[PDB]
């Protein structure tokens, strides 16, 4: 059933993804279809993620530790839109890996790093949520640490992403020109088999479990129920506000799992039964999921807008060059003081709370 590519070479038709078009694998139009999907994605992913990164940096008020983690996520998405999607697009219209083996490596490595980093960052977010809920004590926490933490996630991400570059597994996806870890063969010199189990479980699965677990602990504490006003089942507006953040974080995770999980499952199943067909082992299946994972890059900016008024209002401030932020503003801390932005609403040295300075702000 299999050749180096997913299709059988009953005919001599099969040709290397590096050398020629893969038109035999799927209809040519399907190639343009995937190319089309990528092109549109590039626009959305770039604009949305840039907006997120831009807005939080631009608006002084949105400086939360969580915001730091989100920039990290946004950054990971940006790399996808700039780095990975572009190559994936070129290939698609070419119908194969014009770039050749070196590039397959470059292209797989960066995209792999992006996926690993995302799930790992989501875990940090989960843990931080747990910490915020149980121990509101603000001082046990530092912005500086967050940067350190973010860097750490990247380091671990490299731990999986980089070793394939080290003599380890390698390869292109079903129709593909997307490159990923070598699930198909057990290229012995390469020691593929070991790498495969290790990577999925350690990088994707374990972090998924932790996020799930941390999620459960949060269940006892702040839950979905949150009354819009501070009053009612909320003990302080800040407490009531936080519940909003947690819910978005939950949705962010959910969307993440839905997008990626199918790929990871297919990752493993072919590992167990390579050279065979799953329900059907084909170009189409592997392809659909990996490209689907790419869509994730776009979803987070949408969730933010829908999910939180603060970003929504603050973003709008950014969109219209001037303030022009009608629509009711944040009606809370657009900024703590009032409106928030680089300028405009976010007044220098935003106000402080408590005789002492409760939040590390107004420093």
């Amino acid at each position: 059933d299999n050749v180096l590519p997913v299709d059988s070479d009953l005919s001599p038709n099969i040709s290397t993804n590096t050398s020629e078009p893969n038109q035999f694998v799927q209809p040519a139009w399907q190639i343009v279809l995937w190319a089309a999907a990528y092109t549109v994605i590039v626009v959305t992913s770039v604009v949305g993620n840039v907006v997120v990164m831009w807005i939080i940096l631009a608006h002084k008020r949105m400086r939360t530790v969580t915001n730091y983690f989100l920039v990290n996520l946004a950054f990971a998405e940006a790399s996808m839109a700039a780095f990975n999607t572009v190559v994936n697009f070129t290939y698609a219209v070419h119908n194969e890996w014009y770039y050749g083996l070196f590039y397959c490596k470059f292209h797989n490595f960066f995209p792999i790093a992006a996926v690993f980093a995302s799930i790992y960052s989501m875990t940090a977010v989960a843990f931080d949520r747990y910490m915020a809920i149980i121990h509101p004590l603000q001082p046990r926490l530092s912005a500086t640490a967050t940067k350190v933490v973010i860097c750490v996630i990247w380091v671990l991400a490299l731990l999986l992403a980089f070793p394939q570059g080290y003599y380890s597994t390698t390869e292109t996806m079903p129709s593909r020109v997307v490159c990923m870890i070598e699930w198909p063969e057990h290229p012995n010199k390469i020691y593929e088999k070991v790498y495969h189990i290790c990577v999925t479980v350690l990088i994707y699965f374990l972090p998924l479990l932790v996020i799930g677990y941390a999620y459960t602990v949060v269940g006892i504490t702040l839950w979905a129920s949150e009354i819009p006003g501070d009053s009612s089942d909320r003990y302080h507006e800040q407490v009531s506000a936080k519940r909003k953040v947690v819910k978005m974080m939950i949705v962010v995770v959910c969307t993440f799992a839905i997008c990626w999980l199918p790929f990871h499952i297919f990752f493993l199943l072919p590992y167990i039964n390579p050279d065979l067909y799953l329900k059907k082992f084909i170009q189409q299946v592997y392809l659909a999921i990996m490209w689907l994972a790419m869509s994730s890059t776009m979803y987070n900016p949408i969730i933010y807008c829908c999910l939180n008024d603060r970003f929504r209002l603050g973003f709008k401030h950014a969109f219209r060059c001037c303030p022009f932020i009608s629509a009711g503003d944040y009606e809370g801390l657009e900024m703590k003081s009032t409106r928030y932005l680089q300028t405009q609403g976010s007044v220098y040295k935003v106000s402080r709370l408590e005789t002492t300075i409760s939040t590390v702000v107004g420093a």
């Binding site: 050749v3 040709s15 290397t16 050398s19 083996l101 390698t170």
Partner: peptide, 11 residues
């Protein structure tokens, strides 16, 4: 073709 180009010994 993907077979004759088994020179992937580089990766």
């Amino acid at each position: 073709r993907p077979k004759p180009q088994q020179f992937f010994g580089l990766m």
